[PDB]
Amino acid sequence: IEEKPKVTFKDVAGIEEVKEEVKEIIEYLKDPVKFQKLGGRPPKGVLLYGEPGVGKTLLAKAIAGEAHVPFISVSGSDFVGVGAARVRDLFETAKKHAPCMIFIDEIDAVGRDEREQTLNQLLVEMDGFDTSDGIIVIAATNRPDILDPALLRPGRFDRQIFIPKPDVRGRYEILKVHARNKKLAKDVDLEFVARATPGLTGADLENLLNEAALLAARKGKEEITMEEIEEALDRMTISPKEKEKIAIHEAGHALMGLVSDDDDKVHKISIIPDKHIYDKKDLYNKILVLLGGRAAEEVFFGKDGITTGAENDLQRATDLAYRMVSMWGMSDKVGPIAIRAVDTSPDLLREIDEEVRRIITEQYEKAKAIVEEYKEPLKAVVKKLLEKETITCEEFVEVFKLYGIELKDKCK
Amino acid sequence: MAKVYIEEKPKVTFKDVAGIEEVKEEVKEIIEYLKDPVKFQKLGGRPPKGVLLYGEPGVGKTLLAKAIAGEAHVPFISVSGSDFVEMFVGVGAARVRDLFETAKKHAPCMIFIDEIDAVGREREQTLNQLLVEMDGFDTSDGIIVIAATNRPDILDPALLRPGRFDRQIFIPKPDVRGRYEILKVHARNKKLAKDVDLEFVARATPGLTGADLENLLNEAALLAARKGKEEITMEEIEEALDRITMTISPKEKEKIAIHEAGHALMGLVSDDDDKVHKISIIPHIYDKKDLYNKILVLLGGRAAEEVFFGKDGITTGAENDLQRATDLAYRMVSMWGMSDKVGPIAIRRDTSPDLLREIDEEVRRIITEQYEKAKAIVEEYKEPLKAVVKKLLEKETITCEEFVEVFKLYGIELKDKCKK
Amino acid sequence: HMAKVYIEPKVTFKDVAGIEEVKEEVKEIIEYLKDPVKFQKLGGRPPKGVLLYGEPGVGKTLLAKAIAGEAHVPFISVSGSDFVEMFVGVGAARVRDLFETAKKHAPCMIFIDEIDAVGRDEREQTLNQLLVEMDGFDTSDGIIVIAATNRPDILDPALLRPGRFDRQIFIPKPDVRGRYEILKVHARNKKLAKDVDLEFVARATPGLTGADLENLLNEAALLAARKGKEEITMEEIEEALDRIMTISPKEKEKIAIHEAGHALMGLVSDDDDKVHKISIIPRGMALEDKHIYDKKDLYNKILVLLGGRAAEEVFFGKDGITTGAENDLQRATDLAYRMVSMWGMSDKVGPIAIRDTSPDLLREIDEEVRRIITEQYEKAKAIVEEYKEPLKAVVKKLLEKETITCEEFVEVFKLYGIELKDKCK
Amino acid sequence: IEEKPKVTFKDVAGIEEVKEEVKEIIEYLKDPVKFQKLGGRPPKGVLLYGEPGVGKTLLAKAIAGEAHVPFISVSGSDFVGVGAARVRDLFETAKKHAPCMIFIDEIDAVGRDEREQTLNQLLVEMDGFDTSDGIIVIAATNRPDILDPALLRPGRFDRQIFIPKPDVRGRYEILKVHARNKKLAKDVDLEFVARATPGLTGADLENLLNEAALLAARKGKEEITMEEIEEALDRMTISPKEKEKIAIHEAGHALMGLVSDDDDKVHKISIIPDKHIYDKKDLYNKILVLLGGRAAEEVFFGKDGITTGAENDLQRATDLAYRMVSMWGMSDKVGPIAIRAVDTSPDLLREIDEEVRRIITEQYEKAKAIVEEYKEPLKAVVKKLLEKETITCEEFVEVFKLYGIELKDKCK
Amino acid sequence: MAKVYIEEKPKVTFKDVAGIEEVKEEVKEIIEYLKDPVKFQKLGGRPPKGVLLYGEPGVGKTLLAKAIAGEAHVPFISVSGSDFVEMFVGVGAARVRDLFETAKKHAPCMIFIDEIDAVGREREQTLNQLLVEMDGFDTSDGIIVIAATNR
């Protein structure tokens, strides 16, 4: 697929922080020789990851549009040995249309036999082009956890941007953008609709206004009223009980961060989902923070109230614990041996799993004790998070200050 | 070569379509859009571009599409997916471009693509040309593309992507009422005798499609004609019926009904799991309690099978329920650290066999716990369940409300979990 | 595919700001290129390949161009990405042709930007062809190859072995003085106002490269021009600043202790390879067989690899050990695993070689590998514990100078009355 | 590679039994429509297997030559996804040149990922052509033991011909063929040279005469004398000690065959290397025969004298024992279960290996006892085999008859 | 493009080659064949068509080949495996056919292919053309091909 601009930042609502990040990509695509004579090297690949419908393809299309540069679209599933040829051809086409943008949706389909050979051909094509070409590849994925680490290595998709689900403010701005082409009545309050749609993506909101328009049309009306919007709403939204669980989890992580011995700045708590060296204590602390969400879930709701929301934090914590034991020899029992894994005895594998379980349980018990200790000021924080949807790190600290508890200065 | 058919305003309407009122209700916006596209356009409304109709052969997919066009009084442009088999060069891709060209010329109209699976499994040359033609037309054009398939499992995912055939409607095989209503529709042109009981014929045809029934009445008419009769009697209908000996056995039906009732009963009792709907013999954050409950519901079908038929009567029908239940149990233990024994460790899908054993043990613990629970529930409400199964066997399809009403008769108040 | 041949002035050392230590290192390269015959008659043997590694825009191509300029010698520029294809063995031919062109224009300089693209199968054939072309030319030719990389961590070790790019120079991001000196260089062709304080601009640009600063002054000049001014004021510089990361001092101390750890192992080893320039390079930058090694030589190579971590534990405790020892630990274990399962250097396992093997043997192998590593780790730790006081001294010097010579390390130990092994260069 | 006849059966020495087998292939290639109107179906693929240099490519070339039909040559190693395309193209070319012969040398390279996909493409191309095409594929391999069973399945290479190393008679006939283009002296005795070259292949003999010719030329002679032939010989021949070991092994197999309870006819003992149902006793007996060679080696030479020659017989015996246990449920311990194998518990695998070891050792002890019993008439048979190189089954039985032992009537 | 060298009767002999007497002894039949091919041909003798010389760079592979030609007083036709890098179409395969054509015209002679690894690792088009040209010539021609490789 080969398209042209016709979509800019005016069609993208919110994500101003993301918009700011990608601004160098738009400046580079406008005139690559300014950046080439400069000496600086822009990214070759940029990974856009988030939930479906958050506007990853939209952002990529807006980048191309703002730069007035061709947009060459393709999907990961569109890639027996002919898979590797298609990759070579895509980049060939791109170099011919330079300065332009390559867009790869579902990069996870090609980047997780024919499934492992096309992957390498993409990797070599990424290493094949330079800044001189004046081209940039933007990939999008809903499952970055299943991505091949090789893809994120330096020279290839070494830049990653997480596009989040819209907050109440974000939802309203999206609604405004998608309401432009709709004949809405005076009585419609888009501010209310934003409040009434926590959990929805930009796509869900676009569909909600589209559905309301189709209803008003079916009904035989010259405007869209709140009636239609409520009807379109009923036709994906976070329950108040669900919201409470998310808020307790999120507060859990923040409390761990504002109490953890060393580094990592804490930031904006919301009911919405390396060049550095780290010591053993730093990693124990990072695990402590990751388990915080779940620790809060158990302390507040019991063993039967623990939720599916802790999925990534648990994965990350365990992944970090295995690295400590099997890669960084941070276990006394295992020793300073490093295993990178089908030549290793089951006895060592057992010894590794045991140590990983030891670390996680140690920290989980610690995290739980901390939540148990500050349960009353936490309840207060959760009440604020439920009401406001989003709170600043400063706000959290000030709520604890009210309960006579001075937390660590780690915000922004 | 090639051949595209154009019926400027068809004569088939919803009166020629029987027993898919839920489907009829869904497609009503497509009718309203085709009647006046600018009413929609002048508001910012964007109807679907493509609508996928999938079901068994003869359930009435082309019929429904023809009725949509007829109800809207709009041309029906028919074409077959197999007619895009290029004879030298990329003539397949040209035909696609031409079909949409023809359609835009006859707007407001309907494009109908039978066997979309033939063009959407040089192959990706015609397929891509269809995909670009789908992205090429807008709501301004006032046209809609309806594709039909018997094999949606072999369809290219690209076809179902947003902007294309992003709306999919499953057309099911008719239940008793469905079958009778179809027979009534197809009996209209036929000279039937007074003795013919179409209500009996519908009961006697579980598993037949609208086409099979249309053919059954057509065969009975040919039998009566050859015999030298002016009317069609039950004799000819029974004779025409016998050409059916891949149907639903009554013993088989009982097993399906008990399994289906099993799931519904679990759903209407499960502590916080959500929304039960239409029981038929015819084909996000979750807490630990919610997932235990989801497993409970999945095991319901089998639990009912054992309670009613014994360990020797349990069936292959529980295959996917069992898989799903175990997959969910495995995720609770190895991914969401919902096991006290295993702890809050996560193994996403390298592992010592001792941990693998510990995981399998815990998964077995959860499933057996819930299976024993489900069985106890079926054992408790066996008498009102027998009542539900008896109703489900004669009606083939019952509403959740109907189930709850049967239980109400046995003095048992179930959870208000019916879909509204 | 192309190659660009530069004819000589324009770029000399006067256009290169604040890397005087680097400028001093490369001075032999400039002298050799001037008259290759005079320097071999004198006795000086030059490098075949010089690797320049650092972040993008840190003046690696600039330094290389200045070397060629100062020597008045052709500069043949090429990129690693120009030697990739998959389809046909034309990649290997281009390498042969580049060196052919170079020999025709001698005395001259070859410059390979992005050497990492060709240094990581049709790409492998090209990598080997480069390696053989490196071994193909001599000092008699009068050519030196300078390669530049932003990713030296992903470079093939084969490229850096003796005879190839065996000289490596790390070009760092400019500190405040560095930034100020660069600003001065790039301010020469600009009409700046009296009110502009380049010393302030230096403090206001932490983390920028020479390239970023060059562009900042260029952008400020364009803003003053578009405003209709003959001079550039602080207003335009602040505006140009807005239009567009770090290393911690605690982190720096950890790196310095780790790096010092390796060097102490090397200068005590009992039998090893040469040790050189100890430096505080960030995790991102910084970086066998063919010949015969005995069991003692390999035990010693493991000893050196564990040195960094051994220092981390001796100085910071078990809670202070860091992620920086990641490759050292991997390499040490790989080497231990080869000793046991390939070279039958274990008495318990015997002279058996495992290339389909019982778990009992796998257990026996893992046990022995753990024995070797722990033995050596305890040895390394004991060495760090013994020379903890002169090491603290080395780290303090390393922290303030950010880079110390092998000679400086040995003379610090000399101060503490400890005579180390004569290694270095 | 595409060649034309120019080589017939006159260039092939001996292998008259093989020559007789392939005669239908030559008659079919001459006029396929006679065989097509007939109703009969010739083989699609014919596998030629034997040691290197025995004349597998030669026989194939002679088949094409005798039939006056094109010979299209290719090798297995000449076959990333482009491997499967080459196969399709070869058969395309063949169908265009029909009636003709396809020749695939080293079929083991393609018939043992890209290594497993080209294999399937060959299998489908084999199933693609019919008798109507009037083409035949002849494959050659030195390692048929490593061949994928799929290749030998009905419709594809379901015909297999073993080409053996030449016996003294065979060697003489080959020497005669290769002596035709050589200027040999009157004193040269090719009958002696055959006797003096046991173990050599047709290729070795061709080279021996070629080397003798080059020596005589170098020496400055107008003829090749015995001097040159002996010199060329010295420049792969079976030692007399080695010969004794082979003879004891071969006698071992024959004795088992002439004593085994039921079926399988015994034939020609030499010092040179399904549509049917079998019962448990038949298979125990087949194992007994297979172990016979080794059993004789141990009885005669001791545990330190057992040799590498038993390699195939041991493989075959074990392969047969595993099939009895894991496929045909002929083990009481394992039961009537059939395992065809990465879903099976190690406990069952252990139980299977134990039973296989039980069967083999049982039979090995039996075979050894039989050799021990008839050691004296066996010594007599070995003396005859050493002298004559080859003996008939009848001759063996007659030698035992002399020692007053009446064997089973199982010859020909 | 391309370049094939012809030294009709070289001046390097075995006196210019040192310390490989075992190798010198092996190749002595190649010398004797090149001196008079019909002596061999009139007996049914078939010498090698191709001889591969492999070793480290600078051990004297081209030297030995040149000495073989010199000792036999036979032309030495030198060519490099890298010179079969086609410039459009299949011009690589044509060069191979031409080399053997040239050789047959100068018989009895010696073909020398340095870096045979460059042509023998479109790639299989020139490689196959070499293979067919090798199978194309006979002992009657009175020519020998000596290839040298480091890899």
Ligand SMILES: Nc1ncnc2c1ncn2[C@@H]1O[C@H](COP(=O)(O)OP(=O)(O)O)[C@@H](O)[C@H]1O
């Ligand atoms: N942030 C947003 N602002 C405005 N519209 C949005 C936003 N996010 C999504 N949308 C709308 O939702 C639709 C789906 O977005 P898309 O980028 O295709 O999905 P994805 O994130 O899966 O790649 C588009 O039509 C786009 O207009």
Ligand SMILES: Nc1ncnc2c1ncn2[C@@H]1O[C@H](COP(=O)(O)OP(=O)(O)O)[C@@H](O)[C@H]1O
């Ligand atoms: N629900 C139904 N109501 C009435 N007639 C039906 C129904 N389903 C099928 N039929 C009849 O069966 C025949 C086949 O219908 P058709 O649409 O072609 O099947 P398919 O789903 O394979 O496209 C038609 O003559 C139609 O009238």
Ligand SMILES: Nc1ncnc2c1ncn2[C@@H]1O[C@H](COP(=O)(O)OP(=O)(O)O)[C@@H](O)[C@H]1O
């Ligand atoms: N040390 C420095 N002194 C002066 N100018 C510098 C310095 N570092 C960078 N610059 C300038 O920045 C630009 C980019 O430098 P360049 O050589 O391309 O960097 P690299 O090769 O490391 O990517 C050049 O114009 C150069 O003059």
Ligand SMILES: Nc1ncnc2c1ncn2[C@@H]1O[C@H](COP(=O)(O)OP(=O)(O)O)[C@@H](O)[C@H]1O
């Ligand atoms: N039975 C034989 N009769 C005559 N010559 C033979 C015989 N076996 C081999 N040769 C000769 O030996 C050479 C090698 O035979 P070939 O068929 O190519 O080997 P392989 O059996 O490995 O395929 C040929 O030149 C052929 O003339």
Ligand SMILES: Nc1ncnc2c1ncn2[C@@H]1O[C@H](COP(=O)(O)OP(=O)(O)O)[C@@H](O)[C@H]1O
């Ligand atoms: N054994 C040797 N005796 C004499 N000179 C030798 C010997 N080996 C190499 N040389 C000399 O070394 C040089 C290179 O020889 P050459 O054949 O080109 O090397 P290679 O094996 O790479 O082809 C020649 O000038 C040759 O005289």
Ligand SMILES: [Zn+2]
């Ligand atoms: Zn979390």
Ligand SMILES: [Zn+2]
């Ligand atoms: Zn079910």
Ligand SMILES: [Zn+2]
């Ligand atoms: Zn280190």
Ligand SMILES: [Zn+2]
């Ligand atoms: Zn045998």
